C-alpha cells in the first residue's frame, strides 16, 4: 504494498476555508476491514484527530469539530477529500492522511500513513523589505567567526526561512535553532561560528525569504 500519496495547497490567509486530497495505491474496496483517516498537528504540540471513513459509506468525526467540517471521496476520481471552514490562526498545522483495518467485532487497526503537509495559515498583513547585513563591515565579530546576512526587517507573522548545517559536516558547525523575535514586530535570523568576511572564498553572503509573504531577497557588503 500500500501507499498513500498526499497533496494540497501550502499556504492560505486566516478566515479562509481549507481543503486537501489523498490517493492510495492498493485497493479502494468499499467492504473489507479497511478504512481511511486524517490527522493534524500545530508545530510545538501533539498530533490530533479529525475524521474517518469505515467500511461502507460509514463516516464520523469529533462533535467538537462538527459544524466546521465535512468529508467526501470520489473513488471514480480515485480520491479522498477533507474540507474545513474558517481557519483561526491555530488551525495552522501539519496534516496527514491514513489507513484503518478491522480486527474483532467493532475493534480495529490504526497503523499506516501518507507523507503529510504543512497547512500554513497567517494574516496577509505583510511588507516588501530586503534582507540586511550582520557583516564585519561594522565590528560585530572578527573575520575568523562571522555570518554576513540572513536578517529580514520585521512583520506580524513568522517565519524567515532560516537554515544552517544539513551538509556532511553534521558536527562542530552544529546549529543554533531560532523561531521568533518580538522586536516591536516579529523578526528572524541565526548565525554559526564559521570564518567568512566576504563572498570571496565561499557562499557566506546569506540571502533569504519570509514565508507568509513569498519573495526571496538579497543584500551584500564586504
Amino acid at each position: 504494498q500500500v501507499t498513500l500519496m498526499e497533496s494540497g495547497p501550502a499556504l492560505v490567509k486566516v478566515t479562509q476555508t481549507l481543503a486537501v486530497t489523498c490517493t492510495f495505491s492498493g485497493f479502494s474496496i468499499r467492504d473489507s476491514g479497511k478504512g481511511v483517516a486524517w490527522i493534524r498537528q500545530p508545530p510545538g504540540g501533539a498530533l490530533e484527530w479529525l475524521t474517518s471513513i469505515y467500511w461502507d459509506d460509514t463516516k464520523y468525526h469529533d462533535t467538537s469539530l462538527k459544524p466546521r467540517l465535512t468529508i467526501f471521496r470520489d473513488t471514480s476520481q480515485t480520491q479522498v477529500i477533507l474540507i474545513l471552514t474558517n481557519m483561526a490562526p491555530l488551525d495552522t498545522a501539519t496534516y496527514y492522511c491514513g489507513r484503518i483495518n478491522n480486527g474483532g467485532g467493532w475493534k480495529d487497526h490504526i497503523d499506516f500513513w501518507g507523507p503529510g503537509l504543512l497547512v500554513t495559515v497567517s494574516s496577509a498583513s505583510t511588507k516588501g523589505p530586503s534582507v540586511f547585513p550582520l557583516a564585519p563591515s561594522s565590528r560585530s565579530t572578527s573575520e575568523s567567526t562571522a555570518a554576513l546576512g540572513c536578517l529580514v526587517k520585521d512583520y506580524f507573522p513568522e517565519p524567515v526561512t532560516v537554515s544552517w548545517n544539513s551538509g556532511s559536516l553534521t558536527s562542530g558547525v552544529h546549529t543554533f535553532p531560532a523561531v521568533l523575535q518580538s522586536s516591536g514586530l516579529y523578526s528572524l535570523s541565526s548565525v554559526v561560528t564559521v570564518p567568512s568576511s566576504s563572498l570571496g572564498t565561499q557562499t557566506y553572503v546569506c540571502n533569504v525569504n519570509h514565508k507568509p509573504s513569498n519573495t526571496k531577497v538579497d543584500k551584500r557588503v564586504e
Binding site: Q41, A46, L134, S140, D154, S171, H174, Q181, S183
Partner: protein, 206 residues
C-alpha cells in the same frame, strides 16, 4: 482522556519505560513513534502484540488501564517523539500527549551559551540584536534574568525552548528584541541567562 509523561532516559542498549493511561474496554490502545513531526510509525496492535513487519526492542505489555512502553535495548531513534492512542467509538479516534524522550548516556553536551554583538548595518533592518546563541546543555535548561547596566529595557519574549540538533548536542536561541529606536534609547544590553548554571556578559557595541 489519555495521559503521557513529558520525558524519560537511559543510555543505548539499556532498558527504560514510558507511562500511558488506557482502558480495559478500549484494550485496542497502542503505542506509536513520530520523529520531529515526520512520518509516524505504529509499534503495537492493541496494547501487547507487535504486528508483522515491526521489530522487537520493546514491549507495551498487557497493561490494560495504563499502556506501558518498556524498552530492553535503547537506540538513537528512541529520542524521536512517541505517542499513545486507541479507537474511540461510532467512527472516532482517541489520541495521547506524546513524549520527546532523551537517550541520556550519550556524550554530555556543555556549556555553549555565547553572545555575538550586532553590526551597524543591522540598524537598517530596525534591529541591533543580542545574538545570544544557545547550544550544548544536557539536558537543555535556562532561566530568566537579563541586564543592560543602569538602563530601562524592552526585552521581548525571544527565548526558544530546547530543540533538536544535527549531532544531538541540544540547542536553542534567545535573540533579544533590540530595535533601532530601543538601541538608541538603551544601548548596553547583555546576554545574562543561566545556561545549565553558566552565563556570559560581553555588553554590546555596533
Amino acid at each position: 482522556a489519555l495521559t503521557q509523561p513529558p520525558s524519560v532516559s537511559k543510555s543505548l542498549e539499556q532498558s527504560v519505560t514510558i507511562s500511558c493511561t488506557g482502558t480495559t474496554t478500549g484494550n485496542s490502545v497502542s503505542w506509536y513513534q513520530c520523529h520531529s513531526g515526520t512520518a509516524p510509525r505504529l509499534l503495537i496492535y492493541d496494547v501487547n502484540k507487535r504486528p508483522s513487519g515491526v521489530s522487537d526492542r520493546f514491549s507495551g505489555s498487557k497493561s490494560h488501564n495504563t499502556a506501558s512502553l518498556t524498552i530492553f535495548g535503547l537506540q538513537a531513534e528512541d529520542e524521536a517523539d512517541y505517542y499513545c492512542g486507541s479507537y474511540g467509538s461510532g467512527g472516532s479516534l482517541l489520541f495521547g500527549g506524546g513524549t520527546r524522550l532523551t537517550v541520556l548516556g550519550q556524550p554530555k553536551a556543555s556549556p555553549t551559551v555565547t553572545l555575538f554583538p550586532p553590526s551597524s548595518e543591522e540598524l537598517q533592518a530596525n534591529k541591533a540584536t543580542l545574538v545570544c546563541l544557545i547550544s550544548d546543555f544536557y539536558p537543555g535548561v535556562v532561566k530568566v534574568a537579563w541586564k543592560a547596566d543602569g538602563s530601562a529595557v524592552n526585552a521581548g519574549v525571544e527565548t526558544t525552548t530546547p530543540s533538536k540538533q544535527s549531532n544531538n548536542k541540544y540547542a536553542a536561541s534567545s535573540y533579544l528584541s533590540l530595535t533601532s529606536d530601543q538601541w538608541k534609547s538603551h544601548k548596553s544590553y547583555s546576554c545574562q541567562v543561566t545556561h545549565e548554571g553558566s552565563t556570559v556578559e560581553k555588553t554590546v557595541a555596533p
